[PDB]
Amino acid sequence: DKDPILRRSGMYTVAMAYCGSGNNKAIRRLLHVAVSDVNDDVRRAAVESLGFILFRTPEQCPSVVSLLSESYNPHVRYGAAMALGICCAGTGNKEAINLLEPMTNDPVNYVRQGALIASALIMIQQTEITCPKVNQFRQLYSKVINDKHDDVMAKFGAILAQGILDAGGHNVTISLQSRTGHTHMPSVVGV
């Protein structure tokens, strides 16, 4: 199609059709759109969809979004951040956080916002022992929100991230797939 928004609907359809199957062809399509399209929102929607395909093998999302985070296009950066967020949900990977750290101080603001929300999604409920970097991230949220020299979008991101980190008391997690392994359709829809 020529209308950009319908193309975005198409990327979302690819995302929801192949949810968790890791279908290499759907990945091929989304990445080709991510690097080749002319609109920026379609690029962002494409990078984001990758999260839905590859969430059963979180070891693979960083492998295909590390280079894409360090991208000239800010919307692609935000897409990589949120793709890591959905893909590695409730897992607390060292790698995901290693990618999400440097870019939480990205010059563009909405990139910082997406980075903070992605970190809050990944490192939900983890204590000091489980991940060494939880305390760093709580302190980062506090510093960002208190600061006044920083942008408003970043403050929004930090606030939502504080909300996410400790949700429903401290006794609820985000699992796209049920403990047996079935895809949890409400979780996909919600995220």
Binding site: K2, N109, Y110, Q113, V152
Partner: protein, 283 residues
Amino acid sequence: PAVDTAEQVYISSLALLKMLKHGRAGVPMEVMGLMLGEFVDDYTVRVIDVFAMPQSGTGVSVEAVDPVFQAKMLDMLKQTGRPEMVVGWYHSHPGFGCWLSGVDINTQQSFEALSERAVAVVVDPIQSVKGKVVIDAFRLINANHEPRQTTSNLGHLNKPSIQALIHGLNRHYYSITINYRKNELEQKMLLNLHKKSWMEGLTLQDYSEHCKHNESVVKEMLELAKNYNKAVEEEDKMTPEQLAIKNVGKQDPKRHLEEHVDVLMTSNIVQCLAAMLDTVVFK
């Protein structure tokens, strides 16, 4: 009572070309004009077509000279199928960026009093380059708080420039996102401008000119290869920093050789393929 930050002003292709051309015409002067369109929703303000206006002024100010033209032209355009009525005004700042001044603000304030959601569009012909066009749409903040309400990131994606801030952005006026949405036939003709006739595709070159061009470039490559030799012998007896200055004001053989090789090889391949393709097609 919102004016959300997701509100956009839709400029058509024709309107953009008209603004840009009119502005470049009066390069030292603040030429100006009107824009016709519609008010669809609280998130869209569509600008369909524009029309220049009779005017006179100096390099420091410009003003209309007749309103008869405005009403008459509205009637004529309405006759042939463009009933839309005015939605704002545009003018050109030739080299000063895009912002609003005191006089600008005064005229825009009169327009806004006329209709609430009026916009001001500013173009900078000389600052616009081949690809990107320097342009922006504005509106006036009152003396009341926050001028507009936020329900998305659609407002905060542009990083307003230092000059626009200095001259009053986000203090007396606020910007609006500009969308260049286009229909199918516009898309189809914009792609059809740069297309040459079909005969040009299958025309060879004057072969004598071909050979002269080839021999000229090769006679250049001779000396470039000599200099390449004279230059590779260095790069060992040269300090790691000194090399970064070795190539300032002095030809470099490597890059020129790369360029000439690409030129020669492309040109010859294309000529050969055309010759063979013709050799087959026409009997």
